């Protein structure tokens, strides 16, 4: 014993069940599914008919980002886009909403990448997860067109 590795699968499930969120037989339904694949199995508890958001809300606490509600009620400032352009934006996955705290509050529903952006941005931002759904709607709302 005292030999562990844990893989995503154990990222996911040790944070589901932190909180009870689902059960072991929903898990294991998936994990048949990852042994065929290898792929997150993330993926594969939401094709079991659980939300896709639960999947985010947990990647959130993991990483240590604040997992956002939704977009619809945000008003993304012209200031926020002057230091995370729309061609930056896409390449990160990132979108800026505004200056809080004396920092810039940026949404990503792709944080993968979130460390690497904080030292090539090496100014003071702040860092959000969301779903990629609100995102999409989030970026053109930031971005927007004539």
């Known amino acids: 014993g005292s030999s562990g590795?844990?893989?995503?699968?154990?990222k996911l499930g040790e944070l589901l069940l932190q909180k009870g969120w689902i059960s072991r037989e929903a898990l294991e339904e998936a994990l048949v599914e990852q042994e065929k694949t290898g792929d997150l199995l993330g993926r594969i508890l939401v094709r079991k008919g659980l939300p896709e958001?639960?999947?985010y809300r947990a990647l959130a606490e993991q990483k240590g980002l604040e997992f956002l509600e939704?977009?619809?009620g945000?008003?993304?400032d012209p200031s926020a886009a002057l230091l995370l352009l729309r061609s930056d934006a896409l390449r990160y996955g990132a979108v800026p909403i505004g200056f809080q705290n004396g920092e810039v509050e940026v949404v990503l529903?792709?944080?993968?990448?979130?460390?690497?952006?904080?030292q090539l941005l090496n100014r003071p931002a702040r860092f959000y997860l969301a779903l990629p759904q609100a995102w999409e709607e989030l970026f053109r709302r930031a971005y927007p067109q004539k």
């Open 70 to 72: 939704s977009t619809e």
């Open 74 to 76: 945000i008003v993304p």
């Open 5 to 10: 590795e844990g893989q995503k699968d154990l």
């Open 53 to 55: 958001e639960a999947l």
């Open 109 to 118: 529903s792709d944080p993968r990448h979130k460390e690497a952006v904080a």
